[PDB]
Each structure stands twice: as structure tokens, then as C-alpha cells.
């Protein structure tokens, strides 16, 4: 068994973290006080769930997790909430005043002053590990802490833990719930400085989750609570292989091996089905074929984009519940004859499939209905680059006028950092295009 440390940065990171750890406790049969009756080895062990939980002598199962925010109100809610007994104070780190939606404030001004404390607190967790694998890092792109502090942390983590993998769960900005005009700047700045330190990042666009909640959960105006419970289900699907017995994606290294053949192009698209309202009186349970087919609908993706118009480098199907391989393969056969699924020439056309027999756990009093079977597809498709194009375009509009730039220069960032970050993003868009697009015959209109 090899441990994984989770790090939750800024409001989005912390709130999503809280939702994930609640769900993990329910999936593993861990009570809010940390006791786990089904666990017959008191005070330690090397079971798969021990990848995410250590154990005290008293039999408490403690998340291998650190929470960091530059103001205290969000983490205070963890300290006082339902799962408070799970955590001890050395895992909860708060500053007094936040980064004011300013990457430069988070990275340079405040980050310089709290970074060493955060590393000491992570080291305390690392020292408990017999075979630390690496880190799972949760944060928004748009917040000053989620953007600026995360990139600083990621850099220092590569220094202090050079051989360890680092995965991200990153929240991409959507004006329907965003809280700052400068979020495109923060997103591009943090993506630029983090790119080389991250081995695999799962981007979730708040726009996509928001609309899934509206459309499929019949929630008129989704809140972060609604959004985060859904995000937690997708995260759990993705990390299930680390926490349960299995032979697919069983360590962080395998995520990169299976999903990221090309290091800069390390952003797999997640797609999830089914999402069904708990308020739904009558519901016909969906088959393996029906939920698998749903994985190729943009409406169920964590980022709205069109994979028919890009290419795949890798595809993983992760099932939970009543699923056997024969039905998966029958489903895939059918889907091949109906969908546009083109792989790059230098990868095989295929799917890696994991099945865990336990159906998804739902949080009591949640919005999601219990289902007999669910699936999360992780595909590395160049189509996700549509999201980089959208962001880069917004950046360009504001930066051309230097709108808001003074806020960043005022925290000691050089203006050159903007253009450096943006050039890095231009090259990224180009890499996606090169990998994903065949030239289109030119013409000598009005024909």
C-alpha cells in the first residue's frame, strides 16, 4: 500500500474537499467520529483504504489531508461541521486576509508568508507514510488563493518531493457563479506556472456542472452545495481505484501512464452518467449500454466541448455497480458503429475498463438518486482545448487594454509575467491543434 496526501487550497478547494471526504467516509463505512467498525485491524494496517486514511491507536480513521485558505471563514466551517472530529488542528491552516481574487497577492505577497507553515504541515503527514505516492491538489483557477498560492505550493512540492506524482482537480471559471472579473487572468497565470509541476489535471468547468444540475437535477438555481456534491461523485469515481481493491489505475503513476502519453497535454476530459434527481418519483433504471452511450454526449461532460472534432489519445471507462465485461464490450461495439471516435495514429484505438461492483454511494438528503450502475469516462481528447481557447480569448480582450493589470503589478508581479504566461498558453493551444487536427484542403468562396 502506498499513501496519497490530499491538499485543498482556497474556498473551492476546501468546500469540494469537504464534500469528497464526507462521501469517502460513507463509501468506506467510516463514521463522523472516525471509527470504522468493519476495520478489524485496530490502530493500523495496509488496506487499500489506508491510502487515504491513517489510523490512531484509538481506532480513529484520519484523512491524509491538509486544508489551506488565506482567510478563515471556510475552513472554520470544517472545524465546526459534521466531520470535525475527523481532523486535528495541524491539518487546518488559515491566514487572516485573503488574496482578493488576485493571483499575485496569493502567490507573492501572502504566499511568501504562509508557504513554510503549509510545507511543515504536509511534512508531518508525509512522515507518517511508509511509501508516499504523491499528492492530489484541489483548487479553483479563478480565486487568488486557488490560483496564486497553488502554483507556489506546486513548485515547492516539486523541490521537496521530486519523485512524487501530483494530480489536480481544478475548477474552471464560469460567470454564472463566478465572483471576479479577473478570473481569466488568474487561470492563465496559474496554468502557466503549474504546467510543468502537474502530471495529470482533471478540469471541471462550473458551467457544465451548473447546467447538469439545472437540466438533470431540476435545480432552478444551483448552489455550491449542489455543485460540490456532484463534483464529489466524479472525484470519488476517479479516485476509487486508489481506495479499493483493483488492477486498473492503482497508483498515481498509472494515471499518467494510461491517460497522458504527451506530458504538456495532461488534461483528461471526465464524463459522468447517469445523473438522476432524487425527487424523481418514477425512474426507469439505465442499462450498461445506455450509461455507456451517455459518455459520448457533450451534455454529460465536465467541460462542454465536442470530441467528434478532435482526437483521442486515451480512453478509460470506470464503472460502479451492476456491470459485467460482456455487456461493456457489447455496448462499446454498438457505440463504435454510431459515434465519431478517432484516435491519434500513434495510440491504439481501445478502452481500459475498471468495474467496481459497489454502486455509487449517495449522501442522504442529497439531490442525486440511487442508481444500479454508473460510469465515469476519462478520455484524453484534444477537444478539451476549446476551453483554453475560450479562456485565452477573454484574457486577450482585457490584457490588450491592460485592464486590471495594476492590481497585479502592485503586488510586485512584473507585467512580463502576463505575456510569458499567455505565450505558454498559445504554445499549448498549438500543441493540441498539431496532435488533433488534419490539414483541411485550401481553396482558391462565392462558388
Amino acid at each position: 500500500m502506498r499513501e496519497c496526501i490530499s491538499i485543498h487550497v482556497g474556498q473551492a478547494g476546501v468546500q469540494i474537499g469537504n464534500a469528497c471526504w464526507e462521501l469517502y467516509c460513507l463509501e468506506h463505512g467510516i463514521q463522523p467520529d472516525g471509527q470504522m467498525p468493519s476495520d478489524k485491524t485496530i490502530g493500523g494496517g495496509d488496506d487499500s483504504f489506508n491510502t487515504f486514511f491513517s489510523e490512531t491507536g484509538a481506532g480513529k480513521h484520519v484523512p491524509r489531508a491538509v486544508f489551506v485558505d488565506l482567510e478563515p471563514t471556510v475552513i472554520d466551517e470544517v472545524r465546526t461541521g459534521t466531520y470535525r472530529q475527523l481532523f486535528h488542528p495541524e491539518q487546518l491552516i488559515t491566514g487572516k486576509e485573503d488574496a482578493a481574487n488576485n493571483y499575485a497577492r496569493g502567490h507573492y505577497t501572502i504566499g511568501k508568508e504562509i508557504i513554510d507553515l503549509v510545507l511543515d504541515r504536509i511534512r508531518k503527514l508525509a512522515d507518517q507514510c511508509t511509501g508516499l505516492q504523491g499528492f492530489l491538489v484541489f483548487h479553483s483557477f479563478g480565486g487568488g488563493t486557488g490560483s496564486g498560492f497553488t502554483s507556489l505550493l506546486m513548485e515547492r512540492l516539486s523541490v521537496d518531493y521530486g519523485k512524487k506524482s501530483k494530480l489536480e482537480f481544478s475548477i474552471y471559471p464560469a460567470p454564472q457563479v463566478s465572483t471576479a472579473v479577473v478570473e481569466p487572468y488568474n487561470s492563465i497565470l496559474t496554468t502557466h506556472t503549474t504546467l510543468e509541476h502537474s502530471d495529470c489535471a482533471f478540469m471541471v468547468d462550473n458551467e457544465a456542472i451548473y447546467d447538469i444540475c439545472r437540466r438533470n437535477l431540476d435545480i432552478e438555481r444551483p448552489t455550491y452545495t449542489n455543485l460540490n456534491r456532484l463534483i464529489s461523485q466524479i472525484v470519488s469515481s476517479i479516485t476509487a481505484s486508489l481506495r479499493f481493491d483493483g488492477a486498473l489505475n492503482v497508483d498515481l503513476t498509472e494515471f499518467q501512464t494510461n491517460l497522458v502519453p504527451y506530458p504538456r497535454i495532461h488534461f483528461p476530459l471526465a464524463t459522468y452518467a447517469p445523473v438522476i434527481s432524487a425527487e424523481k418519483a418514477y425512474h426507469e433504471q439505465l442499462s450498461v449500454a445506455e450509461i455507456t452511450n451517455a459518455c459520448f454526449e457533450p451534455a454529460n461532460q465536465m467541460v462542454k466541448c465536442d470530441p467528434r472534432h478532435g482526437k483521442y489519445m486515451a480512453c478509460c471507462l470506470l464503472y460502479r455497480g451492476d456491470v459485467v465485461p460482456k455487456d461493456v464490450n457489447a455496448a462499446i461495439a454498438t457505440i463504435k458503429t454510431k459515434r465519431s471516435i478517432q484516435f491519434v495514429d500513434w495510440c491504439p484505438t481501445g478502452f481500459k475498463v475498471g468495474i467496481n461492483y459497489q454502486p455509487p454511494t449517495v449522501v442522504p438528503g442529497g439531490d442525486l438518486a440511487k442508481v444500479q450502475r454508473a460510469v465515469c469516462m476519462l478520455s484524453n481528447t484534444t477537444a478539451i482545448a476549446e476551453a483554453w481557447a475560450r479562456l485565452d480569448h477573454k484574457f486577450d480582450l482585457m490584457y490588450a487594454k491592460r485592464a486590471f493589470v495594476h492590481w497585479y503589478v502592485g503586488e510586485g508581479m512584473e507585467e512580463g509575467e502576463f505575456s510569458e504566461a499567455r505565450e505558454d498558453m498559445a504554445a499549448l493551444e498549438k500543441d493540441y491543434e498539431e496532435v488533433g487536427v488534419d490539414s483541411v484542403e485550401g481553396e482558391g468562396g462565392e462558388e
Partner: protein
């Protein structure tokens, strides 16, 4: 449509299906960047205080 590497356990199973085959900065450096930005805040603040002194 070949199934390979089928692995089974009590908790589930995994396998692969193939349809077709194919054809960092150091601590010193980070420190220096953080200190350089601090120097810039310090300079901009000194300039402000000079203007207020005038």
C-alpha cells in the same frame, strides 16, 4: 475487438479492449523570485511615502 489483461477480484474486475492497433526551479530560485517581488512592493511603497513627504 480483443479483450486483454482481464483481472478479477471480489470487489470488481478490469480489462482492456482493443479495436485497432496504432500505425524545475530550485529552492534558491523560488526564494529569489519571491524576494524580488517583495523588493518591488517595497520600492513602490517607498516612492509613495516620498510623494506624501513632499
Amino acid at each position: 475487438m480483443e479483450v486483454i489483461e482481464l483481472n478479477k477480484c471480489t470487489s470488481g474486475q478490469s480489462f482492456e479492449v482493443i479495436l485497432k492497433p496504432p500505425s524545475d526551479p530550485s529552492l534558491e530560485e523560488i526564494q529569489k523570485k519571491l524576494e524580488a517581488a517583495e523588493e518591488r512592493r517595497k520600492y513602490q511603497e517607498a516612492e509613495l511615502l516620498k510623494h506624501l513627504a513632499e
